[PDB]
Amino acid sequence: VKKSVGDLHKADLEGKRVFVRADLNVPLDKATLAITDDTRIRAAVPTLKYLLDNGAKVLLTSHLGEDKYRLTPVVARLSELLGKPVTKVDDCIGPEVEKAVGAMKNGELLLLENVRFYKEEEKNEPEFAKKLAANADLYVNDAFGTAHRAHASTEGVTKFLKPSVAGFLLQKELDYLDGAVSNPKRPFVAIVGGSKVSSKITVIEALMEKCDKIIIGGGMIFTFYKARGLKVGSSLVEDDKIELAKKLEEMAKAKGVQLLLPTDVVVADKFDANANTQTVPITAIPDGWMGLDIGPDSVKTFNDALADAKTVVWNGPMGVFEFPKFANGTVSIANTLAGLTPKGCITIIGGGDSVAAVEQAGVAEKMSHISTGGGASLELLEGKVLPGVAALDEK
Numbered sequence: 001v002k003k004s005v006g007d008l009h010k011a012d013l014e015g016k017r018v019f020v021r022a023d024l025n026v027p028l029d030k031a032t033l034a035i036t037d038d039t040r041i042r043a044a045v046p047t048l049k050y051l052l053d054n055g056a057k058v059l060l061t062s063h064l065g066e067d068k069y070r071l072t073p074v075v076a077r078l079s080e081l082l083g084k085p086v087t088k089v090d091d092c093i094g095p096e097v098e099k100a101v102g103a104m105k106n107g108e109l110l111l112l113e114n115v116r117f118y119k120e121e122e123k124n125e126p127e128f129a130k131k132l133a134a135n136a137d138l139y140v141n142d143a144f145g146t147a148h149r150a151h152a153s154t155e156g157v158t159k160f161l162k163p164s165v166a167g168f169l170l171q172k173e174l175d176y177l178d179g180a181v182s183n184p185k186r187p188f189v190a191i192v193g194g195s196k197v198s199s200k201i202t203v204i205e206a207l208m209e210k211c212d213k214i215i216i217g218g219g220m221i222f223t224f225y226k227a228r229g230l231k232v233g234s235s236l237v238e239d240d241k242i243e244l245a246k247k248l249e250e251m252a253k254a255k256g257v258q259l260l261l262p263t264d265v266v267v268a269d270k271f272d273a274n275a276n277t278q279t280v281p282i283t284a285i286p287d288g289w290m291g292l293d294i295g296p297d298s299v300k301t302f303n304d305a306l307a308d309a310k311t312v313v314w315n316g317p318m319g320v321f322e323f324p325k326f327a328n329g330t331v332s333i334a335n336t337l338a339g340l341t342p343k344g345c346i347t348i349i350g351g352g353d354s355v356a357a358v359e360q361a362g363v364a365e366k367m368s369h370i371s372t373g374g375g376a377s378l379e380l381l382e383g384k385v386l387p388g389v390a391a392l393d394e395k
Contacts, residue, residue, distance in 0.1 A: 026040050
């Protein structure tokens with residue numbers, strides 16, 4: 001629905017000054033400022049290489065940090081992964097930018113200083129966005145992780161640049177998180193895990209509009225079980241969400257969604273990787289014990305339910321996978337999805353703990369898509385509209 005940088009050809013790009021908003025906000029080691037994860041930079045280079053190879057003059061902008069950094073720590077890694085030099089400018093507006101842009105040749109890339117040094121950036125003030133656009137001809141948004149904010153560099157500048165299109169990274173995020181979910185190939189199974197059903201309501205509700213089955217895991221199952229009148233030992237529950245838990249089960253049936261909860265759990269006598277454990281049916285949770293993983297019968301049931309899936313969305317671990325005795329639920333599910341991807345199934349991962357889970361489970365490169373922008377991922381999987389995306393041209 002939104003035009004892409006790929007919809008533009010060399011006539012549109014050669015010799016043009018292209019303002020690019022990228023997500024280069026890579027984690028830094030506090031003492032050395034070395035990059036501990038350059039995934040975001042690597043994800044950013046295909047848009048940049050396409051532009052530079054078509055003769056564009058790229059003006060690249062990003063943030064790095066509520067504490068702000070200059071972009072110095074990323075210049076060298078970006079150039080190495082770009083395969084092209086990178087000229088730094090110590091401002092994102094004004095005569096120094098204008099001078100640097102004037103000296104550029106086709107196929108060169110400029111890196112402007114961190115836009116968030118101006119308070120006008122997060123205020124989305126139009127006169128500042130105007131100054132940002134003053135040395136550009138057109139606009140590419142490749143910063144999905146900030147597309148839910150309305151900032152000058154992510155939204156305000158589009159009012160002064162034509163066309164305004166989505167980069168390749170942003171388009172991929174939309175292709176998987178929006179397209180693949182809204183027009184899904186079936187069977188479409190959603191997997192949602194978490195400690196608290198309160199944190200996962202809207203994503204669960206959003207996914208029930210589209211999916212065939214929902215698998216529910218993690219510590220939040222115990223509020224569902226308490227809502228059935230079952231004992232849940234010392235498992236943490238949200239008593240104020242008990243009625244909500246009943247409504248979700250009802251809503252699933254009304255919409256034709258198979259709701260799957262575990263039938264057995266691994267319980268611990270304390271929240272400890274070294275706890276004593278038992279594996280019990282969910283109807284006989286011992287007093288004073290807490291459920292820290294789904295049990296083997298539930299692992300088998302969930303795997304069977306996934307065995308013919310053509311789309312899977314996974315958000316949230318099945319148990320405390322950081323504890324080896326309680327990891328089998330998450331690791332098994334992670335590796336089931338990893339085996340589905342080569343069979344044609346579309347496997348999509350979202351959430352900070354699910355990405356730490358797929359790393360610990362050794363499947364981090366084995367999925368269709370792992371979302372680079374956490375807070376934007378949830379809001380898109382929520383069905384609300386991102387100001388950064390809405391501002392782009394229609395295809």
